[PDB]
Symmetry: D2
Subunit: 156 residues, 4 copies
């Protein structure tokens, strides 16, 4: 089975331009490394950019929702009070940027003892998540760092 890498981040209103670029490049790299991308299938900031990037590099995408870039739409029927991407399906969860919904998904991943890679979250986030579980939180400085952390974690 191919690894499944989850991607979470803010929506369109709350994603900065550099975060969009990071998300698009992360998605490309997920695809090139032979991994399946799991993210939100409706949301049009980080999650859509990640999807696009993965598809542009020929990878397989799972979009979770309550775009042509979505290969496998998974429709949860849980509505949207939570940005649920069925993230427990992922081997590793990557957050690009930060916001309330992203925070909740990162915290729940840590609850389930799953590793999280934080990319472009500012210092409070990094420090706060590290305080919850230092052993499971990986802070990435850039996309290449995030991919490298993912690679290591899959090797473990």
């Amino acid at each position: 089975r191919k690894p499944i890498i989850g991607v979470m981040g803010p929506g369109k209103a709350d994603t900065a331009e550099n975060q969009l670029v990071m998300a698009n490049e992360l998605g490309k790299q997920i695809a090139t490394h032979g991994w399946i991308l799991l993210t939100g299938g409706r949301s049009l900031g980080v999650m859509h950019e990640a999807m696009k990037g993965a598809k542009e590099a020929g990878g397989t995408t799972i979009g979770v929702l309550p775009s042509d870039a979505v290969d496998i739409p998974i429709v949860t029927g849980l509505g949207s009070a939570r940005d649920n991407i069925n993230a427990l399906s992922s081997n590793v969860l990557v957050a690009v940027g930060m916001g309330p919904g992203t925070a909740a998904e990162v915290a729940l991943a840590l609850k389930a003892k799953k590793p999280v890679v934080l990319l472009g979250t500012q210092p409070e986030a990094e420090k706060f998540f590290t305080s919850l579980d230092a052993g499971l939180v990986h802070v990435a400085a850039d996309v290449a760092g995030a991919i490298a952390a993912v690679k290591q974690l899959l090797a473990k």
Copy 2:
């Protein structure tokens, strides 16, 4: 995008031998028609047999859970009070046999105005579901009938 056909039915204790055979043959046919099979990824009566059959015919399988035959495991983190297979992801839902959990999923599909094909449910079930929504309930006498109903519904 390939069609996604959902399969629901009872677990190991409550699936009769002929239902197991039907489920395995349905899974084969789903695969041969170029469709993705969506079913429970833990449950070891109808749902496992469907999975096996699909894989034996070279098809792609999505297993939903709270086997090597599962290609894409989707882990919901919703526990098991409901036999949730994220069935709203399906174009058509097929029930093979009947039991409380299967009944709930068929009723919820009808709630969402999605077609359901009933295979090897006895008369009370057929009559009861038809009473809920006649236009959306398709009673199949055998696997070939169920596939044929699915084919028609995808053409619509």
Copy 3:
């Protein structure tokens, strides 16, 4: 020393006959009069709203479950889950009573039986009664009227 919680389910406005609205209101009255808590949908329309009005009139405590509200609801429980299911957190109830029948109701009754909880069917048609009884004969109680439903509930609680 906890008060029993009786769940009530039924179809909404469009798919409910007036006899069902009246039965639901009376049922709500009797539930409260017996000192039981009513648990139902909190969204203000058919069977569930009538039950809620009935219980409040008789002085009972009401719990109304919403995904995302009448003054008849004492305690609004907001689940933040879909509208895809008529979820009323029914596993909380000691007994679930269905007044009439539709797809959402049917799902909840079936999930109650999956949980091995008893269900009382009031004003459902023969197909339903026969179908749910085939799912689990020991947990499905068919009631001919509100009195019969209340008696079924009371006996269940006494066990």
Copy 4:
């Protein structure tokens, strides 16, 4: 004319300091004394159990949410959802108070902010206070003690 519902969240047994247990009990007392309903987890261990004991001692009404129970719980709500989330149907609460902090608590606080509900942080460490305040400065109230928490809640309800 509905009673306010105040939600309380915190970590379970293993990850709770005794000061937090004491704060939670006092908080529960004060919530009940103000005539408010306590909504918390119904599973009998750390902060949430202490809060529940406190509210019951002061005569308040308690709602304890479980996936699948102390005599201190008046109304057990059983969600039939995972243990993957410490779901207490918190969207039901007018204000959510966190006493201490761990991953489940953090998720619920973050989801409250996503819903634009106010949150009171009591006995959380600076990292948390600073992080949640960066998420939404207008909805996050940092409380230095139980009195401060209660005053924050009371002011919020008065608005």
